[PDB]
Ligand binder design. Sequence first.
Ligand SMILES: [Mg+2]
Ligand SMILES: [Mg+2]
Ligand SMILES: [Mg+2]
Ligand SMILES: [Mg+2]
Lengths: 290, 48, 43, 55, 31
Amino acid sequence: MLRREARLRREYLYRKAREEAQRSAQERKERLRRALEENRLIPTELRREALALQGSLEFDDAGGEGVTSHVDDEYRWAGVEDPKVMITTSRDPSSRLKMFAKELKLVFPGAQRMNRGRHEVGALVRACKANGVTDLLVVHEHRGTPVGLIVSHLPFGPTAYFTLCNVVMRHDIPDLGTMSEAKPHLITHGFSSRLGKRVSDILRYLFPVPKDDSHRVITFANQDDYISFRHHVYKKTDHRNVELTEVGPRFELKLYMIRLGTLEQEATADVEWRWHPYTNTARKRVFLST
Amino acid sequence: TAQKRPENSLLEETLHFDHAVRMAPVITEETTLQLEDIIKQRIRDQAW
Amino acid sequence: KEHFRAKQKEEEEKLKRQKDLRKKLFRIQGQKERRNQKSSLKG
Amino acid sequence: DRNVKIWGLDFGDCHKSLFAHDDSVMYLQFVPKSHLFFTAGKDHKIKQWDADKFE
Amino acid sequence: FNLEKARLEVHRFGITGYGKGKERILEQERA
RNA sequence: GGAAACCAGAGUAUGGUUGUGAAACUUAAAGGAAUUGACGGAAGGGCACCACCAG
RNA sequence: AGGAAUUCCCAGUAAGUGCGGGUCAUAAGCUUGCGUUGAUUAAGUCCCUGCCCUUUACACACCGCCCGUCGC
Ligand SMILES: [Mg+2]
Ligand SMILES: [Mg+2]
Ligand SMILES: [Mg+2]
Ligand SMILES: [Mg+2]
């Protein structure tokens, strides 16, 4: 199994290297295909090798997988199987942190929370991979308030680092009751840039495919690179009029890191994107919106 | 430096300087009502 | 090293003049390709 | 039609439109002292309204 | 109705009568 | 004899230009659709350190 | 040696102890890693508090119709 995991990773990185070549290889194919379909001069860059493209074009069919994308390879079983999420905390947690980790279990369908004792960081990733855990969440705290969040996709998936800003928990609010706990509908709003499409994908795949008539709503709203997490359930009193009742925790997120590897590989994994605060134009730039 | 100037002198100086990064947004009722409006619109349209 | 840098400078002006000279010749060749469009289907 | 409308005489502006009865309204009349009127319709009912507060 | 679109799709359907092998050589000739 | 003759072209990209009242009034689907619609009760199958039991 | 109420917790888990780092976010009487010693009770029911579903692949065997209201 250890050799299998090492073998698969090299295939994953190796395919990532040639994704740019294959996109360039594909893009020049349609221009020739457009050139033959509508009788017009073949572009001079395609003037040579034109017959070779035609032969591969004639081979092209629906059966082939097509051009490879690293996002698809990372999230291979996103739709077919329901995700399995495990939630843990840092060593020696506070009382309020153990409340927060208890609430994230209810938010994510099918999540489980395990006590972090003396478990080294490396061993947890090994155990999660062995038992088929899809996603791993690690949460930090400062003076009884959660302050950091890490989301990791176990099969050599991307690792996303977050910092929390305005956390309000249900345990603060009296006599709320019990949650609906049904499979939720997802509302993603404000993500427009290419990186914004990347980040919204990571957050969406933490959830299973819901039912059509589900009344549970989870909203991720981006406003000036700050993502707002909101949890609501609605009741249709009558046509065109809807009532919203808030349930669940309320907190904000700020992304500053995405790494290709897992949280066991800080020393080897490459950085897809980092937040650089000491750039001269750092204060006047946003990345999740265009 | 610090020694030359009197104590708490800069509190009234009204100097001009720049900030490194954007301050965190402040939550208010107006933000809450606006955000609920976005969710309500998508619920009516069933634009999940 | 100083010699090699100077040699690159001559090439850049040389390539610049090469583009302009071929530009006049290219348009004549382009006109011939128009005729091949009309005869593409026929033979 | 089931609606009843209040208008100002000075300029002809409609202040309010009310659902009132479930069928055609048959008769209307104000109380003498104040801006309260009584209405009757084919819905077996009698209702009174405050023209100022539209209630 | 555009002849240029119409001519080509007529031409493609015409070639298929010849046979699959004759398709390759004629399509090669065109390009 | 054939010019050192003879006579007198496409692609992208970036910008421009254009192509008798529904409110002053109304959340009663501007007053709907339905053989296709709207609700309530009971029973069975599971589950929980958002519940029991033992600590 | 910290009432009334209330929160959390099932195995290298609860609890005690030391030793490092400050890593482009957060962090100073704080934050995160690493190791050492290492337990008591429990492996099951819907009784309370609730949650998610249902009551229209014909091997053998087993079993043999959920109910009510208003609209059209
Ligand atoms: Mg401990
Ligand atoms: Mg310990
Ligand atoms: Mg005590
Ligand atoms: Mg310690």
